[PDB]
Design an enzyme around this catalytic site. Structure first.
Site, PDB file in Angstrom:
ATOM      1  N   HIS A 171       4.040  10.684   6.460  1.00 39.99           N
ATOM      2  CA  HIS A 171       3.538  10.653   7.842  1.00 39.99           C
ATOM      3  C   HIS A 171       4.554   9.650   8.272  1.00 39.99           C
ATOM      4  CE1 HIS A 171      -1.280  10.284   6.430  1.00 39.99           C
ATOM      5  NE2 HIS A 171      -0.800  11.693   6.375  1.00 39.99           N
ATOM      6  N   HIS A 184       1.686   9.260   1.182  1.00 39.64           N
ATOM      7  CA  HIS A 184       0.806   9.168   0.334  1.00 39.64           C
ATOM      8  C   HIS A 184       1.414   9.948  -1.372  1.00 39.64           C
ATOM      9  CE1 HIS A 184      -0.997   6.251   3.428  1.00 39.64           C
ATOM     10  NE2 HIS A 184      -0.690   7.740   4.213  1.00 39.64           N
ATOM     11  N   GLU A 228      -3.240  13.148   1.371  1.00 37.97           N
ATOM     12  CA  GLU A 228      -4.997  12.844   2.576  1.00 37.97           C
ATOM     13  C   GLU A 228      -5.711  14.151   3.289  1.00 37.97           C
ATOM     14  OE1 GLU A 228      -3.559   9.217   4.456  1.00 37.97           O
ATOM     15  OE2 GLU A 228      -4.752   8.418   3.243  1.00 37.97           O
ATOM     16  N   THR A 244      -5.099   6.296   8.494  1.00 34.14           N
ATOM     17  CA  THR A 244      -5.829   6.796   7.585  1.00 34.14           C
ATOM     18  C   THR A 244      -6.024   5.712   6.894  1.00 34.14           C
ATOM     19  OG1 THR A 244      -3.723   7.472   6.206  1.00 34.14           O
ATOM     20  CG2 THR A 244      -4.994   8.813   7.555  1.00 34.14           C
ATOM     21  N   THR A 245      -6.106   3.897   7.061  1.00 36.23           N
ATOM     22  CA  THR A 245      -5.468   2.780   6.205  1.00 36.23           C
ATOM     23  C   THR A 245      -6.306   1.750   7.113  1.00 36.23           C
ATOM     24  OG1 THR A 245      -3.376   2.770   6.642  1.00 36.23           O
ATOM     25  CG2 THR A 245      -3.841   3.648   4.571  1.00 36.23           C
ATOM     26  N   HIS A 251       1.385  -0.783   0.402  1.00 40.58           N
ATOM     27  CA  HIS A 251      -0.005  -0.027   0.082  1.00 40.58           C
ATOM     28  C   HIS A 251       0.944   1.064  -0.282  1.00 40.58           C
ATOM     29  CE1 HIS A 251      -0.040  -0.360   4.344  1.00 40.58           C
ATOM     30  NE2 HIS A 251       0.120  -2.102   4.288  1.00 40.58           N
TER      31      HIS A 251
HETATM   32  N1  LIG Z   1      -1.579   6.453   7.175  1.00 41.70           N
HETATM   33  S1  LIG Z   1      -1.239   6.473   8.956  1.00 41.70           S
HETATM   34  O1  LIG Z   1      -2.429   6.934   9.858  1.00 41.70           O
HETATM   35  O2  LIG Z   1      -0.204   7.326   9.046  1.00 41.70           O
HETATM   36  C1  LIG Z   1      -0.899   5.218   9.565  1.00 41.70           C
HETATM   37  C2  LIG Z   1       0.080   5.138  10.548  1.00 41.70           C
HETATM   38  C3  LIG Z   1       0.483   3.564  11.027  1.00 41.70           C
HETATM   39  C4  LIG Z   1      -0.495   2.523  10.409  1.00 41.70           C
HETATM   40  C5  LIG Z   1      -0.308   1.080  10.980  1.00 41.70           C
HETATM   41  O3  LIG Z   1       0.627   1.217  11.792  1.00 41.70           O
HETATM   42  N2  LIG Z   1      -0.752  -0.353  10.683  1.00 41.70           N
HETATM   43  C6  LIG Z   1      -1.135  -0.409  11.603  1.00 41.70           C
HETATM   44  C7  LIG Z   1      -1.810  -1.693  12.621  1.00 41.70           C
HETATM   45  F1  LIG Z   1      -1.532  -0.572  13.235  1.00 41.70           F
HETATM   46  F2  LIG Z   1      -2.726  -1.267  11.954  1.00 41.70           F
HETATM   47  C8  LIG Z   1      -1.169  -2.954  13.063  1.00 41.70           C
HETATM   48  F3  LIG Z   1      -1.286  -3.516  11.911  1.00 41.70           F
HETATM   49  F4  LIG Z   1       0.059  -3.196  13.649  1.00 41.70           F
HETATM   50  C9  LIG Z   1      -1.917  -2.841  14.199  1.00 41.70           C
HETATM   51  F5  LIG Z   1      -1.412  -2.206  15.591  1.00 41.70           F
HETATM   52  F6  LIG Z   1      -3.138  -2.228  14.505  1.00 41.70           F
HETATM   53  C10 LIG Z   1      -2.521  -4.656  14.827  1.00 41.70           C
HETATM   54  F7  LIG Z   1      -3.587  -3.994  13.408  1.00 41.70           F
HETATM   55  F8  LIG Z   1      -3.378  -4.237  15.731  1.00 41.70           F
HETATM   56  F9  LIG Z   1      -1.027  -5.225  14.331  1.00 41.70           F
HETATM   57  C11 LIG Z   1      -1.663   2.850  10.056  1.00 41.70           C
HETATM   58  C12 LIG Z   1      -1.769   4.433   9.268  1.00 41.70           C
HETATM   59 ZN   LIG Z   2      -0.154   7.186   6.346  1.00 36.56          ZN
END
Ligand SMILES: NS(=O)(=O)c1ccc(C(=O)NCC(F)(F)C(F)(F)C(F)(F)C(F)(F)F)cc1
Ligand SMILES: [Zn+2]
Length: 257
Positions: A116, A93, A103, A195-196, A61
Protein backbone atom coordinates in the site's frame (compact mmCIF):
# COMPACT_ATOMS: atom_id res chain seq x y z
CA UNK A 1 -4.36 -2.61 22.05
CA UNK A 2 -5.57 -4.04 18.70
CA UNK A 3 -3.45 -6.39 16.62
CA UNK A 4 -3.81 -9.55 14.56
CA UNK A 5 -3.97 -12.25 17.31
CA UNK A 6 -6.94 -14.43 18.48
CA UNK A 7 -7.52 -12.11 21.21
CA UNK A 8 -7.09 -8.70 19.59
CA UNK A 9 -7.48 -9.42 15.82
CA UNK A 10 -9.85 -8.07 13.17
CA UNK A 11 -12.90 -9.81 14.67
CA UNK A 12 -12.45 -7.75 17.84
CA UNK A 13 -11.76 -4.28 16.31
CA UNK A 14 -15.41 -3.25 16.22
CA UNK A 15 -15.57 -2.96 20.05
CA UNK A 16 -13.16 0.01 20.15
CA UNK A 17 -13.83 1.10 16.53
CA UNK A 18 -17.52 0.59 15.75
CA UNK A 19 -17.01 1.91 12.16
CA UNK A 20 -15.48 -1.55 11.61
CA UNK A 21 -19.08 -2.55 10.74
CA UNK A 22 -19.65 0.57 8.57
CA UNK A 23 -20.85 0.99 5.01
CA UNK A 24 -17.57 1.57 3.23
CA UNK A 25 -15.00 -0.75 4.88
CA UNK A 26 -11.87 -2.17 3.30
CA UNK A 27 -10.48 -4.45 2.05
CA UNK A 28 -13.01 -6.20 -0.21
CA UNK A 29 -13.10 -9.14 -2.64
CA UNK A 30 -12.81 -7.86 -6.25
CA UNK A 31 -15.16 -10.00 -8.31
CA UNK A 32 -13.67 -9.57 -11.79
CA UNK A 33 -16.80 -10.50 -13.57
CA UNK A 34 -18.98 -7.90 -11.66
CA UNK A 35 -16.48 -4.93 -11.84
CA UNK A 36 -17.55 -2.76 -14.71
CA UNK A 37 -15.19 -1.22 -17.22
CA UNK A 38 -15.64 2.54 -16.93
CA UNK A 39 -14.38 4.18 -20.16
CA UNK A 40 -14.63 7.51 -18.36
CA UNK A 41 -11.80 6.74 -15.89
CA UNK A 42 -8.41 8.21 -16.56
CA UNK A 43 -4.95 6.67 -16.80
CA UNK A 44 -3.49 7.04 -13.39
CA UNK A 45 -0.57 9.48 -13.08
CA UNK A 46 2.07 8.16 -10.72
CA UNK A 47 4.73 10.88 -10.43
CA UNK A 48 7.48 9.57 -8.18
CA UNK A 49 10.59 11.05 -9.91
CA UNK A 50 11.15 13.49 -7.03
CA UNK A 51 10.26 11.06 -4.19
CA UNK A 52 12.38 11.59 -1.03
CA UNK A 53 12.28 8.59 1.31
CA UNK A 54 13.56 9.35 4.82
CA UNK A 55 13.11 6.55 7.29
CA UNK A 56 11.76 3.05 7.87
CA UNK A 57 9.85 2.27 11.09
CA UNK A 58 8.57 -1.00 12.65
CA UNK A 59 5.32 0.23 14.21
CA UNK A 60 4.31 -3.14 15.75
CA UNK A 61 1.80 -3.95 12.96
CA UNK A 62 3.91 -3.51 9.82
CA UNK A 63 6.87 -1.47 8.70
CA UNK A 64 6.40 1.95 7.06
CA UNK A 65 8.84 3.46 4.57
CA UNK A 66 8.23 7.20 5.20
CA UNK A 67 8.60 10.04 2.70
CA UNK A 68 9.11 13.76 2.91
CA UNK A 69 5.54 15.04 2.24
CA UNK A 70 6.21 18.66 3.33
CA UNK A 71 5.75 19.69 -0.35
CA UNK A 72 4.58 18.08 -3.65
CA UNK A 73 7.42 15.70 -4.47
CA UNK A 74 5.95 12.23 -5.09
CA UNK A 75 2.24 12.56 -6.10
CA UNK A 76 -0.68 10.49 -7.39
CA UNK A 77 -3.19 12.19 -9.71
CA UNK A 78 -5.68 11.18 -12.39
CA UNK A 79 -7.51 7.88 -12.51
CA UNK A 80 -10.66 8.32 -10.38
CA UNK A 81 -9.08 11.20 -8.41
CA UNK A 82 -9.71 14.95 -8.40
CA UNK A 83 -6.68 16.97 -7.43
CA UNK A 84 -3.30 16.04 -6.07
CA UNK A 85 -2.39 13.36 -3.51
CA UNK A 86 1.07 13.39 -1.85
CA UNK A 87 2.85 10.12 -1.01
CA UNK A 88 3.42 9.90 2.76
CA UNK A 89 4.43 6.23 3.32
CA UNK A 90 4.20 2.75 2.00
CA UNK A 91 3.92 -0.57 3.87
CA UNK A 92 2.89 -4.17 3.22
CA UNK A 93 0.60 -6.80 4.59
CA UNK A 94 1.72 -10.46 4.33
CA UNK A 95 1.06 -13.96 5.42
CA UNK A 96 2.67 -16.78 7.39
CA UNK A 97 2.72 -18.82 4.11
CA UNK A 98 2.46 -17.81 0.43
CA UNK A 99 -1.26 -18.77 0.16
CA UNK A 100 -2.45 -15.78 2.21
CA UNK A 101 -1.31 -12.27 3.11
CA UNK A 102 -3.13 -9.86 0.80
CA UNK A 103 -6.03 -7.79 2.09
CA UNK A 104 -7.90 -7.35 -1.18
CA UNK A 105 -8.70 -10.63 -2.97
CA UNK A 106 -9.42 -11.21 -6.64
CA UNK A 107 -12.25 -13.71 -7.25
CA UNK A 108 -11.53 -14.90 -3.67
CA UNK A 109 -7.80 -15.49 -4.52
CA UNK A 110 -5.41 -14.36 -1.77
CA UNK A 111 -1.93 -13.17 -2.82
CA UNK A 112 1.20 -13.70 -0.68
CA UNK A 113 1.29 -9.98 0.21
CA UNK A 114 -0.05 -6.54 -0.72
CA UNK A 115 1.80 -3.22 -0.92
CA UNK A 116 0.00 0.00 0.00
CA UNK A 117 1.34 3.33 -1.21
CA UNK A 118 -0.50 5.88 0.90
CA UNK A 119 -1.24 9.38 -0.38
CA UNK A 120 -3.22 12.34 1.01
CA UNK A 121 -5.26 15.01 -0.70
CA UNK A 122 -3.34 18.29 -0.49
CA UNK A 123 -6.58 20.34 -0.58
CA UNK A 124 -6.93 19.47 3.15
CA UNK A 125 -3.48 20.87 4.02
CA UNK A 126 -2.24 18.04 6.34
CA UNK A 127 -2.66 14.28 6.70
CA UNK A 128 -4.56 14.46 9.99
CA UNK A 129 -7.21 16.71 8.36
CA UNK A 130 -7.30 14.59 5.15
CA UNK A 131 -8.26 11.35 7.06
CA UNK A 132 -11.45 13.15 8.28
CA UNK A 133 -12.71 13.55 4.69
CA UNK A 134 -14.38 11.02 2.36
CA UNK A 135 -11.91 11.91 -0.38
CA UNK A 136 -8.95 12.49 1.93
CA UNK A 137 -6.65 9.59 0.95
CA UNK A 138 -5.78 7.57 -2.10
CA UNK A 139 -4.13 4.21 -1.48
CA UNK A 140 -2.50 2.47 -4.43
CA UNK A 141 -2.56 -1.27 -3.73
CA UNK A 142 -0.24 -3.73 -5.50
CA UNK A 143 -0.37 -7.51 -5.05
CA UNK A 144 2.75 -9.61 -4.50
CA UNK A 145 3.13 -13.17 -5.75
CA UNK A 146 6.10 -15.37 -5.11
CA UNK A 147 8.36 -16.24 -8.02
CA UNK A 148 11.30 -14.24 -9.36
CA UNK A 149 12.94 -11.67 -7.05
CA UNK A 150 11.94 -8.01 -7.33
CA UNK A 151 15.28 -6.15 -7.61
CA UNK A 152 13.75 -2.86 -6.43
CA UNK A 153 12.53 -4.51 -3.22
CA UNK A 154 15.94 -5.78 -2.04
CA UNK A 155 17.03 -2.52 -0.30
CA UNK A 156 13.87 -2.76 1.84
CA UNK A 157 14.52 -6.47 2.60
CA UNK A 158 18.07 -5.80 3.67
CA UNK A 159 17.29 -3.17 6.27
CA UNK A 160 14.60 -5.30 8.04
CA UNK A 161 17.17 -6.98 10.40
CA UNK A 162 17.86 -3.52 11.82
CA UNK A 163 14.20 -2.80 12.69
CA UNK A 164 13.25 -6.20 13.98
CA UNK A 165 11.02 -5.08 16.87
CA UNK A 166 8.25 -2.53 17.47
CA UNK A 167 9.47 1.04 17.82
CA UNK A 168 12.75 0.55 16.00
CA UNK A 169 13.54 2.73 13.00
CA UNK A 170 16.45 3.24 10.64
CA UNK A 171 17.53 5.87 8.22
CA UNK A 172 16.17 5.00 4.76
CA UNK A 173 17.06 7.75 2.30
CA UNK A 174 17.18 7.67 -1.51
CA UNK A 175 14.82 4.70 -1.95
CA UNK A 176 13.00 4.79 -5.34
CA UNK A 177 9.45 3.44 -5.05
CA UNK A 178 9.18 3.28 -8.87
CA UNK A 179 11.06 0.01 -8.49
CA UNK A 180 8.04 -1.60 -6.76
CA UNK A 181 5.55 -0.92 -9.62
CA UNK A 182 4.38 -3.54 -12.12
CA UNK A 183 4.51 -2.81 -15.89
CA UNK A 184 0.79 -2.11 -16.31
CA UNK A 185 -1.16 0.56 -14.39
CA UNK A 186 -4.61 -1.06 -15.21
CA UNK A 187 -6.61 -0.88 -11.97
CA UNK A 188 -9.84 -1.40 -10.12
CA UNK A 189 -11.19 1.42 -7.93
CA UNK A 190 -13.83 1.76 -5.20
CA UNK A 191 -14.50 3.97 -2.11
CA UNK A 192 -13.33 2.42 1.13
CA UNK A 193 -11.45 2.82 4.33
CA UNK A 194 -8.19 2.42 6.21
CA UNK A 195 -7.72 -1.34 6.80
CA UNK A 196 -6.31 -0.87 10.34
CA UNK A 197 -7.85 0.95 13.30
CA UNK A 198 -9.19 3.60 13.35
CA UNK A 199 -10.67 2.22 10.10
CA UNK A 200 -11.62 5.72 8.87
CA UNK A 201 -13.79 5.83 5.75
CA UNK A 202 -11.55 8.27 3.89
CA UNK A 203 -9.88 6.24 1.15
CA UNK A 204 -10.24 6.05 -2.63
CA UNK A 205 -8.76 2.63 -3.31
CA UNK A 206 -6.89 2.04 -6.54
CA UNK A 207 -5.81 -1.63 -6.79
CA UNK A 208 -3.54 -2.62 -9.68
CA UNK A 209 -4.55 -5.67 -11.70
CA UNK A 210 -0.94 -6.83 -12.38
CA UNK A 211 0.90 -8.30 -9.38
CA UNK A 212 4.63 -7.89 -8.89
CA UNK A 213 6.73 -10.94 -8.34
CA UNK A 214 9.01 -11.21 -5.28
CA UNK A 215 11.21 -14.19 -4.35
CA UNK A 216 10.50 -16.68 -1.59
CA UNK A 217 13.69 -15.42 0.14
CA UNK A 218 12.38 -11.84 0.03
CA UNK A 219 9.06 -12.65 1.67
CA UNK A 220 10.74 -15.02 4.22
CA UNK A 221 12.64 -11.97 5.51
CA UNK A 222 9.40 -10.01 6.03
CA UNK A 223 8.26 -12.98 8.17
CA UNK A 224 11.30 -12.63 10.49
CA UNK A 225 10.11 -9.27 11.75
CA UNK A 226 8.44 -9.08 15.18
CA UNK A 227 5.18 -7.54 16.37
CA UNK A 228 6.65 -7.33 19.86
CA UNK A 229 9.08 -4.78 21.29
CA UNK A 230 12.80 -5.51 22.10
CA UNK A 231 13.37 -8.20 24.69
CA UNK A 232 9.62 -9.20 24.83
CA UNK A 233 8.39 -12.73 23.99
CA UNK A 234 8.91 -13.20 20.23
CA UNK A 235 5.75 -12.97 18.14
CA UNK A 236 6.62 -13.17 14.45
CA UNK A 237 5.09 -10.36 12.34
CA UNK A 238 3.03 -12.54 9.99
CA UNK A 239 -0.65 -12.54 8.95
CA UNK A 240 -0.99 -8.78 9.52
CA UNK A 241 -3.91 -8.55 7.01
CA UNK A 242 -7.56 -7.76 7.57
CA UNK A 243 -9.98 -10.14 5.69
CA UNK A 244 -12.39 -8.96 3.02
CA UNK A 245 -15.38 -6.93 4.28
CA UNK A 246 -18.89 -6.68 2.90
CA UNK A 247 -19.13 -4.65 -0.30
CA UNK A 248 -22.59 -3.23 0.63
CA UNK A 249 -23.82 -0.48 -1.61
CA UNK A 250 -20.61 -0.03 -3.63
CA UNK A 251 -19.44 -0.40 -7.13
CA UNK A 252 -15.94 -1.55 -8.12
CA UNK A 253 -14.93 0.05 -11.43
CA UNK A 254 -12.24 -1.27 -13.85
CA UNK A 255 -10.00 1.08 -15.85
CA UNK A 256 -9.54 -1.58 -18.55
CA UNK A 257 -11.80 -3.56 -20.94
N1 LIG B 1 -3.65 -0.24 5.39
S1 LIG B 1 -4.08 1.18 4.75
O1 LIG B 1 -5.52 1.19 4.58
O2 LIG B 1 -3.26 1.50 3.57
C1 LIG B 1 -3.71 2.38 5.93
C2 LIG B 1 -2.97 3.56 5.58
C3 LIG B 1 -2.67 4.53 6.53
C4 LIG B 1 -3.11 4.35 7.86
C5 LIG B 1 -2.77 5.36 8.90
O3 LIG B 1 -2.18 6.41 8.54
N2 LIG B 1 -3.10 5.18 10.17
C6 LIG B 1 -2.75 6.13 11.21
C7 LIG B 1 -3.92 7.11 11.36
F1 LIG B 1 -4.27 7.69 10.23
F2 LIG B 1 -4.99 6.47 11.73
C8 LIG B 1 -3.59 8.26 12.26
F3 LIG B 1 -3.26 7.72 13.41
F4 LIG B 1 -2.48 8.89 11.80
C9 LIG B 1 -4.84 9.22 12.24
F5 LIG B 1 -4.42 10.17 11.39
F6 LIG B 1 -6.16 8.80 12.00
C10 LIG B 1 -5.01 9.70 13.63
F7 LIG B 1 -5.52 8.57 14.23
F8 LIG B 1 -5.91 10.69 13.55
F9 LIG B 1 -3.78 10.14 13.99
C11 LIG B 1 -3.84 3.20 8.22
C12 LIG B 1 -4.17 2.22 7.28
ZN1 LIG C 1 -2.19 -1.19 4.41
Amino acid sequence: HWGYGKHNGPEHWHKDFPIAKGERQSPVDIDTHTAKYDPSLKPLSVSYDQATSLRILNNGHAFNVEFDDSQDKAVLKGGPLDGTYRLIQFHFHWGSLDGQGSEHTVDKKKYAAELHLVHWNTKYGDFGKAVQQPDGLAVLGIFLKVGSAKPGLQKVVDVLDSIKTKGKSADFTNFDPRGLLPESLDYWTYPGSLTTPPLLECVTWIVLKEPISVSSEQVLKFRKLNFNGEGEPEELMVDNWRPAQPLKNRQIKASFK
